[PDB]
Design an enzyme around this catalytic site. Structure first.
Site, short mmCIF file in Angstrom:
data_model
loop_
_atom_site.label_atom_id
_atom_site.label_comp_id
_atom_site.label_asym_id
_atom_site.label_seq_id
_atom_site.Cartn_x
_atom_site.Cartn_y
_atom_site.Cartn_z
N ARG A 182 0.81 -1.21 0.00
CA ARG A 182 0.00 0.00 0.00
C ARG A 182 0.85 1.26 0.00
O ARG A 182 0.38 2.31 -0.46
CB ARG A 182 -0.95 0.01 1.20
CG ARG A 182 -1.87 -1.21 1.31
CD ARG A 182 -2.49 -1.20 2.68
NE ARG A 182 -3.42 -2.29 2.92
CZ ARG A 182 -3.09 -3.50 3.34
NH1 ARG A 182 -1.81 -3.87 3.44
NH2 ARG A 182 -4.05 -4.36 3.68
N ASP B 100 -8.51 -4.61 10.09
CA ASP B 100 -7.56 -5.64 10.54
C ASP B 100 -8.09 -6.34 11.77
O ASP B 100 -8.03 -7.57 11.86
CB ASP B 100 -6.18 -5.04 10.85
CG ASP B 100 -5.65 -4.26 9.70
OD1 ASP B 100 -6.18 -3.15 9.46
OD2 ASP B 100 -4.76 -4.77 9.01
N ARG C 296 -10.88 -8.70 11.03
CA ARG C 296 -10.34 -9.93 10.46
C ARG C 296 -9.75 -10.82 11.54
O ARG C 296 -9.97 -12.04 11.57
CB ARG C 296 -9.28 -9.59 9.39
CG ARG C 296 -9.83 -9.13 8.03
CD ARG C 296 -8.77 -8.38 7.19
NE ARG C 296 -9.20 -8.11 5.82
CZ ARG C 296 -8.67 -7.19 5.02
NH1 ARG C 296 -7.62 -6.47 5.38
NH2 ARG C 296 -9.21 -6.99 3.81
N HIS D 7 -1.99 0.03 9.03
CA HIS D 7 -2.92 -0.82 8.28
C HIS D 7 -2.13 -1.39 7.12
O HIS D 7 -2.16 -0.89 6.00
CB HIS D 7 -4.14 -0.04 7.78
CG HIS D 7 -5.04 -0.84 6.88
ND1 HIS D 7 -5.66 -2.00 7.29
CD2 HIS D 7 -5.39 -0.67 5.58
CE1 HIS D 7 -6.38 -2.50 6.30
NE2 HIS D 7 -6.23 -1.71 5.25
N1 LIG Z 1 -8.42 1.22 4.60
C1 LIG Z 1 -8.80 0.02 4.07
O1 LIG Z 1 -9.06 -0.90 4.85
C2 LIG Z 1 -8.92 -0.18 2.59
C3 LIG Z 1 -8.42 0.75 1.75
N2 LIG Z 1 -8.63 0.65 0.35
C4 LIG Z 1 -8.20 1.66 -0.60
O2 LIG Z 1 -9.38 2.39 -0.92
C5 LIG Z 1 -9.25 2.94 -2.23
C6 LIG Z 1 -10.37 2.64 -3.22
O3 LIG Z 1 -10.06 1.39 -3.78
P1 LIG Z 1 -11.34 1.07 -4.85
O4 LIG Z 1 -12.99 1.49 -4.46
O5 LIG Z 1 -11.22 -0.47 -5.03
O6 LIG Z 1 -10.47 1.83 -6.15
P2 LIG Z 1 -11.55 1.99 -7.43
O7 LIG Z 1 -10.81 2.09 -8.79
O8 LIG Z 1 -12.60 0.69 -7.79
O9 LIG Z 1 -12.42 3.47 -7.26
C7 LIG Z 1 -11.59 4.51 -6.85
C8 LIG Z 1 -12.37 5.71 -7.38
O10 LIG Z 1 -11.54 6.79 -7.03
C9 LIG Z 1 -11.91 7.61 -8.11
N3 LIG Z 1 -10.90 8.64 -8.16
C10 LIG Z 1 -9.59 8.51 -8.49
N4 LIG Z 1 -8.97 9.71 -8.49
C11 LIG Z 1 -9.91 10.58 -8.14
C12 LIG Z 1 -9.82 12.05 -7.97
N5 LIG Z 1 -8.59 12.82 -8.12
N6 LIG Z 1 -11.08 12.65 -7.55
C13 LIG Z 1 -12.18 11.95 -7.42
N7 LIG Z 1 -12.25 10.53 -7.62
C14 LIG Z 1 -11.06 9.93 -7.95
C15 LIG Z 1 -11.79 6.86 -9.42
O11 LIG Z 1 -12.51 7.45 -10.50
C16 LIG Z 1 -12.53 5.68 -8.89
O12 LIG Z 1 -13.85 5.81 -9.33
C17 LIG Z 1 -7.83 2.53 -2.67
O13 LIG Z 1 -6.95 3.54 -2.24
C18 LIG Z 1 -7.64 1.25 -1.96
O14 LIG Z 1 -6.27 1.04 -1.73
C19 LIG Z 1 -9.34 -0.45 -0.19
C20 LIG Z 1 -9.58 -1.53 0.56
C21 LIG Z 1 -9.30 -1.53 2.03
#
Ligand SMILES: NC(=O)C1=CN([C@@H]2O[C@H](COP(=O)(O)OP(=O)(O)OC[C@H]3O[C@@H](n4cnc5c(N)ncnc54)[C@H](O)[C@@H]3O)[C@@H](O)[C@H]2O)C=CC1
Ligand SMILES: NC(=O)C1=CN([C@@H]2O[C@H](COP(=O)(O)OP(=O)(O)OC[C@H]3O[C@@H](n4cnc5c(N)ncnc54)[C@H](O)[C@@H]3O)[C@@H](O)[C@H]2O)C=CC1
Ligand SMILES: NC(=O)C1=CN([C@@H]2O[C@H](COP(=O)(O)OP(=O)(O)OC[C@H]3O[C@@H](n4cnc5c(N)ncnc54)[C@H](O)[C@@H]3O)[C@@H](O)[C@H]2O)C=CC1
Ligand SMILES: NC(=O)C1=CN([C@@H]2O[C@H](COP(=O)(O)OP(=O)(O)OC[C@H]3O[C@@H](n4cnc5c(N)ncnc54)[C@H](O)[C@@H]3O)[C@@H](O)[C@H]2O)C=CC1
Ligand SMILES: CNCC[C@H](Oc1ccc(C(F)(F)F)cc1)c1ccccc1
Ligand SMILES: CNCC[C@H](Oc1ccc(C(F)(F)F)cc1)c1ccccc1
Lengths: 334, 333, 333, 333
Positions: free
Chosen positions: B106, B166, B169, B193
């Site tokens: 990450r 975490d 899980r 995380h």
């Molecule tokens: N804290 C946690 O437990 C978790 C964190 N994450 C993180 O959450 C994030 C989202 O992952 P997903 O929903 O799977 O990615 P995703 O690709 O399916 O959707 C991300 C969205 O962010 C939008 N986006 C990107 N740049 C943007 C900007 N400058 N302004 C507005 N929208 C923008 C994109 O258009 C996209 O629609 C990632 O950073 C992933 O690493 C995901 C899973 C667990």
């Protein structure tokens, strides 16, 4: 150091927090605590405040609730005979006063509960100038009018619990006849929450099917299926339950909780509740009775105009007459 | 003579409404929509605003949710590229940005999502200066730091979803071991995380029974119950799910809804979330990582002090050093 | 001497018990997972089973849900390409198969999805002889007929998701026009879940007020309001959403859960869903299309007889003819 | 043709159905009705049955609840003095009998309530041989023994609500002292649901932080934070509330519903409930008192083995002897 100081490291400055969805229930009898446990069960209030003149039972109810706190989502419960404890409520439910003895008409309660309300309405508005007051105590239509006058609040902020309950009863009885869930049965009891209620036969429907089209005699004296008896069971329901167990409380508690849910979630859902209907259906005074209204976060913001049939308008006018006949003698209200 | 005029007789004058519990979800991807749908499912918002840079997908997600309105309790769902639609949000969830590829740490995403956050964080605060911001995008600890800095908000209104997930899980794997519900298993994963997260073995308990007491070698190489492998499963879990289905979203959306519920219902419940831990356990800089925190309507208002064991403190410090090595070189925050 | 053995004293002897509320979802695509999360968030299942042909996707989805378990009330989440994992389900939701491309009719999905169903449905029936099947895949009406025929189940246990969604959308558009919650707007979209669906104008009502009474031109082209435009928006909705985001899922997910809730809680509530309507409204063959039906724990146990206006009956006959034209040529059923 | 024959067309034949999740509440007093409304508000039963010897009150309570049916999700609510109504109950709550007068000990209620149970319990098992019985009437541990003997049921299906409420009270007071939600405080009140309950100081913990490590005098008489006074408030609470309002009822209704939910959803969560503890912590006789127990659909299937402190084992053995000294002289069970 205290154990609290050893365990807890502050990240924010301590501060007086202002409750968002604070609800006050006034009167902690059967109806008040039905309403309170229903509100708490639906996690509708982040702060519950109880008020009664019986201090011991008031503190006891508050403690019993607080003990169930592990199972709830209401971080603060407070109780006092002093209305300071109701400060900044969003909604104040008023359930205080005398109830019906067995067989006794709610109208026979007016003079007693009017004197009660003269004392409590001002206090509510002193500590929650911006609240919505849901009036429950009987007779509910008259006392909603009395609370509106006594409070000086906008009509949209003083709601009588009205015929929500009657309608719920209607829809259960129809549901029991049809073998379907009450929510899939549609029908509206209107006017006085009491003997003069009006069954809007023309509106009763299942899935948009008018039951009065399936049964043109529905609601007449000559009706092989006798639906007049269903309106009658609705009218007699309170007296029968009061005869059996001395009061009613669970149904109204649930109905009040439903109204509160529509208002605090800003749903704009339509509920038959008691409001000023001056100038509709030919009613000429400031009568309060149940019509279909839009309930949301601002309170009662609209009435639904209906195409009532002749006999239905006539029943509604007679109910308005019965009520105004008592309203017109009410003095010392401002 | 409009049908609305025929049908509705007004009782109050029509006024302009400001919503009470407005939530904004930024990014409408897998994680963003998982969040939005968990939020709606629990009736946590009277108004949901969606924000993204993909205008087409944004309006599509918005419309699909509105088509679901009959089954929900949220009267107003809106969406726009313009952050003006988010104004007066009580809570803003940030999920926008790049995610991990298969096998990718990450931390690899920092450069890109800093550039992302540098644009959106200001916009958020510009229209909702009193909101709480819940950072979800990765790496979420460093990005909660970045958000704190760019936003100028008090640290109690900038929250990183952190190790809530975490720990979920961990508690699931525990309950699988024991045949109990996860909520009856207790145990905290803390720190990053990510790969440097810390299992607080000394806190792991069922009904107040310390499991490390019934096993002083819990978490070590000579452990008959092999709890270390459980912590390794927690660490590897995201990567495994990412390999199988390309991303994760359901659990994190449930996690973020849990947090929002604690804050909107003002419960002061304790969640392992990402906060500024300078001055704790010997950490000397403004590192952000997850500790147990009290959450309510003001946000993140307290941290819980724990009597960590030496090894737990040491893993925690190592995690802080990992993160601070990245943080100290970020510029123009 | 194991942790479990030391921590837990048995009070009952180990027995294999059967779940009381098992739900299976077939297909873990956009729709199957919207359904799953909707079912999970309502605690409608004590055991959830996921089936797909993509084994890795399937495992990933199952792992994500299990990692959310702490926030849920479903102790068993299981996933397998083998239908033995679906055994003893009360309800099986079929969402597997191809979906519409941009601008594609659902009826163009027939042969492909019919072949899919020919393999899926028997498997379901082998392991849950007693279940209710909710068909979701498109065309839902034709495939509900197919499932009835393939399975050998009684009519009351094969239910097409049908127009529940269409009516949901109808009620949403209505609510937007009147400024009330969709639940306080009443109106029925019937027939095919598709281009030939029938707006039942004569049933449209707020608080029992017939809207076609206040506006007898409702549904015609002489209409000052644009009600026919509302029905058109209902018909086009799926295409518009497919164009913005490629598919629809959240609204149908909530619709499937709404139906499951009526069923599992035995409420006998009335939903517009797809059933066998031969012999009603002049329909002459075993057409499946949506009518208002009483749902409860036995499944779909009644249809509601309505006083449709002549134009309404005519649109409904046109729907049933579109559908029967496809049905009559279906072989190996 | 009847109105219903005109409206409703049958899709399935008529059939008698068995409730899936039937709960019977025995006694419709303060406590019985508190349990009833708590169960309904959580949609825990598809059929609720009420029993009492006061026919008029019984019918009235039934009628009230039915009039609330629109806002609920329980399609069938029946009541009778005849236990035929309770047939096929999954869970039967027993709240019938005499309650404490002001200042009166629950043990003083044994004789009268034994005479109640000698009649009620054989009726229960007569119509639901497979049910789980939740005993609430006081003295709850003794009457749970009596019910177990009279019913001939296995231990895992006779559960006394026990200290679930005491622990709830414990946790509330603790949350009040720390400014956090009662669910984020953990602490077990065990033994008799009465004056001899034991506070398990060694397990009291927030986020896994043993508070007796920060306050080693917690539980002793020489403790400036007076935790022993918290246990005192727990022991006195019922007397104080009885003196104020005449009885208690809401908190126990919520506690009972919490138990029912764990069992009907098959969650296997851990609750401090009354079970048969012979052969535990040196207890020699078939005493019933509360330990932490796993609850799921099968009932009470496990007890959690605890590493109690010497003083705590002592207070628990005193509780056991206090109880057995009454249990041993009961006749005709
Ligand atoms: N804290 C946690 O437990 C978790 C964190 N994450 C993180 O959450 C994030 C989202 O992952 P997903 O929903 O799977 O990615 P995703 O690709 O399916 O959707 C991300 C969205 O962010 C939008 N986006 C990107 N740049 C943007 C900007 N400058 N302004 C507005 N929208 C923008 C994109 O258009 C996209 O629609 C990632 O950073 C992933 O690493 C995901 C899973 C667990
Ligand atoms: N709208 C509806 O559908 C229904 C209306 N009601 C009405 O609800 C009201 C109360 O019924 P119950 O709860 O069973 O009576 P209750 O006697 O069991 O409790 C009534 C409460 O009012 C309190 N009270 C009286 N004057 C007070 C004052 N100045 N300040 C604070 N508290 C005061 C009493 O102490 C009591 O605790 C009655 O008027 C009854 O007729 C009852 C059921 C349904
Ligand atoms: N009735 C309604 O209101 C609506 C119905 N639908 C329909 O739902 C269906 C699914 O649409 P989506 O989930 O967006 O497509 P999706 O492309 O995200 O795929 C669903 C899953 O079908 C699976 N599948 C194919 N054959 C299978 C088999 N033999 N066994 C198990 N899984 C199999 C694929 O592997 C895929 O994982 C389509 O037919 C679509 O038309 C979609 C929206 C609303
Ligand atoms: N375990 C716990 O934490 C608590 C247990 N309790 C106990 O709950 C029990 C009931 O308390 P309440 O509801 O306040 O008393 P209650 O006086 O309001 O009603 C008790 C009901 O039992 C009924 N009853 C008596 N004999 C019966 C029989 N043979 N069959 C059917 N019904 C019978 C009475 O008719 C009455 O209606 C008491 O023993 C009380 O100690 C009370 C509070 C909490
Ligand atoms: C809760 N209010 C304080 C939040 C934060 O203040 C802090 C400033 C510095 C530090 C430090 F130095 F890391 F200890 C810690 C906190 C801050 C900084 C700038 C603007 C607002 C808030
Ligand atoms: C409760 N539903 C009734 C059972 C249903 O029976 C049928 C009812 C009607 C027809 C038809 F369409 F008239 F041919 C055919 C079969 C059926 C169909 C297939 C397998 C078992 C039962």
């Amino acid at each position: 150091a205290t154990l609290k100081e050893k365990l807890i490291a502050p990240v924010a400055e301590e501060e007086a927090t202002v409750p968002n969805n604070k609800i006050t229930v006034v009167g902690v009898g059967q109806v008040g605590m039905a309403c309170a446990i229903s509100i708490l069960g639906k996690s509708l209030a982040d702060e519950l405040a109880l008020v009664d003149v019986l201090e011991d039972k008031l503190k006891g109810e508050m403690m019993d609730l607080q003990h169930g706190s592990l199972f709830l989502q209401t971080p603060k419960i407070v109780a006092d005979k002093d209305y300071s404890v109701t400060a900044n409520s969003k909604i104040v439910v008023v359930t205080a006063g005398v109830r019906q003895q067995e067989g006794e008409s709610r109208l026979n309660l007016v003079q007693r509960n009017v004197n009660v309300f003269k004392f409590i309405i001002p206090q509510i508005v002193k500590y929650s100038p911006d609240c919505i007051i849901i009036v429950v105590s009987n007779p509910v239509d008259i006392l909603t009018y009395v609370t509106w006058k006594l409070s000086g609040l906008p009509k949209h902020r003083v709601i009588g619990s009205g015929c929500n309950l009657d309608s719920a009863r209607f829809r259960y009885l129809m549901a029991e006849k049809l073998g379907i869930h009450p929510s899939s049965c549609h029908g509206w009891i209107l006017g006085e929450h009491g003997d003069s209620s009006v069954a809007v036969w023309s509106g009763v429907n299942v899935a948009g099917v008018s039951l009065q089209e399936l049964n043109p005699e529905m609601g007449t004296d000559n009706d092989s299926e006798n639906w007049k008896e269903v309106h009658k069971m609705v009218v007699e329901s309170a007296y029968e339950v009061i005869k059996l167990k001395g009061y009613t409380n669970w149904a109204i508690g649930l109905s009040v909780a439903d109204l509160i849910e529509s208002m605090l979630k800003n749903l704009s859902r339509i509920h038959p509740v008691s409001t000023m209907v001056k100038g509709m259906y030919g009613i000429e005074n400031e009568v309060f009775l149940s019509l279909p209204c839009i309930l949301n976060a601002r309170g009662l913001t609209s009435v639904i105009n209906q195409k009532l049939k002749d006999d239905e308008v006539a029943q509604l006018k007679k109910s308005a007459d019965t009520l105004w006949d008592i309203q017109k003698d009410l003095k010392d209200l401002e």
